[PDB]
Structure formats: C-alpha cells, structure tokens
Amino acid sequence: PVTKTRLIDTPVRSGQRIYAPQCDLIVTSHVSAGAELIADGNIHVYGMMRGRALAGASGDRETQIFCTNLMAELVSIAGEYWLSDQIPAEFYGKAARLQLVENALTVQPLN
Amino acid sequence: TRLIDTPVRSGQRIYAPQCDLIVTSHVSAGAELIADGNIHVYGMMRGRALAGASGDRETQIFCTNLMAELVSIAGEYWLSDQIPAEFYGKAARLQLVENALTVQPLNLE
C-alpha cells in the first residue's frame, strides 16, 4: 500500500475488481468481461481490454486511459463514460487512447 | 414526480434534479435516465437509468420490462450482463442492500 503506481502483470478475470486508490493502474495482461478496473489516476491496459476501466475516479479530469486492444464494456474518465456502443467501431480491437477535452470522451490511436 | 409519456429514443438525456422520474413509454439503447430520487420505467427498458445520482442510498429502480444497458443507484452500478437472467426482460425492483445492488420481483408474491 503506497501512492506508487499499482502494477499488475497478471490478467484480471471476470468478476474481479482492481482499485488503485490515488495512483495509476497498469495491467500488463488481459482484462476479461466482468473485470472492473478503477483508479483515481491513469489506466494502462497492455492486453485484451474486454472489461471496464474507470479512470480519474476521484475527479481528476486530466487523466487518461491507454489500451492496446480496446474491446471494453465501459470506459470512464472522471464521471463521463462511454459504453461499448459509443466506442467508435473504428477502434474495436486496436490501440486507443481516451481522454477528456472539453467535458466529453475523446479517443485517439496513440501511434 | 416527473412524467414522460413519450418514447425516449437513443441519444436523449433525461434529468430529474430532486424528484422521482416516471417514464410510461419505451427507453431506447442510447437513452440515459438520471435522477436523485427513484426511477420507474413502465415499458421497454433497454437503455440507462442512473438513480440516486446525488448519493441517496434509500432510492430504488422499478421496471416492468428490465433490459437495461446500465442501472446504478448511488453510484453502485450494473451492466446488462450483471443483471441476473431471472429478471432480464421482466418486472424487477432494484434496491441497495448494505452497500450492494439487489434485485427482487416487483410483484411481492
């Protein structure tokens, strides 16, 4: 337990919940469907992201979500959230980078 | 306390500041319902309902045909898949027990 970033190089399986209190969260493996990722900082997912990522849970709007395989059910920064359908189909299964610009979700490729 | 007898098509946002929300028609996929009180949906509920938006933990959600994408009370949330299949597409009562989501049948046999 530290403010150090929470690194996890083991997949997060369906039904599990990972909470990084006041630090970034890093998942170097695959995130399953029922898997829920939440952190007050940033969220990095370096595998199949099939679950849920809630970044800036405490209200940090300058935080972002970085994925290599964006297949998420729900992706949230601060309070503003997107469901799988709101995610542009252009990115399903590719590398993506979600951040808040005005007061809304934005997605880029991070190439 | 708030009345909506017109379908809520995909993309709409419905606000209920400090009052219950009642939608007597259909809620579409992208439709987002939010309220600080209770939310009743008496039709095809296939969208999102966020109840107790201000933190009211005594609030509940009442549906007659529960097929929602996302349902949350006081921040605690469920997606369509987390809804027990027993109630998907049926009448359901979402409540907070202790500090977790619970679902019962609306009818109280």
Residue numbers in the entry:
A (entry chain A): 16 to 126
B (entry chain B): 20 to 128
From the manuscript:
In this work, we determined the crystal structure of the dimeric C-terminal domain of MinC from E. coli (EcMinCCTD). The crystal structure of EcMinCCTD was solved at 3.0 Å resolution using the molecular replacement method. EcMinCCTD forms a dimer within the asymmetric unit via domain swapping. EcMinCCTD forms a dimer between the two β-sheets in each subunit, as observed in the TmMinCCTD structure. The tight dimer formed through the MinCCTD beta helical domain is similar to that of TmMinCCTD (left). The two MinCCTD structures superimposed with a root-mean-square deviation (RMSD) of 1.4 Å for the 110 Cα atoms (residues 122–231). Compared to AaMinCCTD, EcMinCCTD and TmMinCCTD both lack a helix3 at its C-terminus. SDS-PAGE analysis of the harvested crystals showed that these crystals resulted from a degradation fragment of the MinC protein at a molecular weight of ~13 kD. Furthermore, western blotting results demonstrated that this fragment of MinC had the C-terminal 6 × His tag (data not shown), which suggested that our crystals were from EcMinC’s C-terminal domain (MinCCTD). This is likely caused by degradation of the flexible linker between the N- and C-terminal domains of MinC, which is easily susceptible to non-specific proteolysis. As a result, we went back to the initial method of using full-length MinC to obtain MinCCTD crystals. It is inferred that MinCNTD, although cleaved off over time, initially helps to promote the correct folding and solubility of MinCCTD. In this EcMinCD model structure, the RSGQ motif of MinC and MinD’s helix 7 make up an interaction interface as expected.
In the Gram-negative bacterium E. coli, a tubulin like protein (FtsZ) polymerizes at mid-cell to form a ring structure (Z-ring) to ensure cell division, which is often spatially regulated by the Min system, including MinC, MinD and MinE, through a pole-to-pole oscillation. MinC, as an inhibitor of the Z-ring, is recruited to the membrane by MinD and prevents FtsZ polymerization. The C-terminal domain of MinC interacts with MinD, while its N-terminal domain directly inhibits FtsZ filamentation. In E. coli, MinC and MinD undergo a rapid pole-to-pole oscillation in response to MinE, which causes a periodic block of the polar division sites.
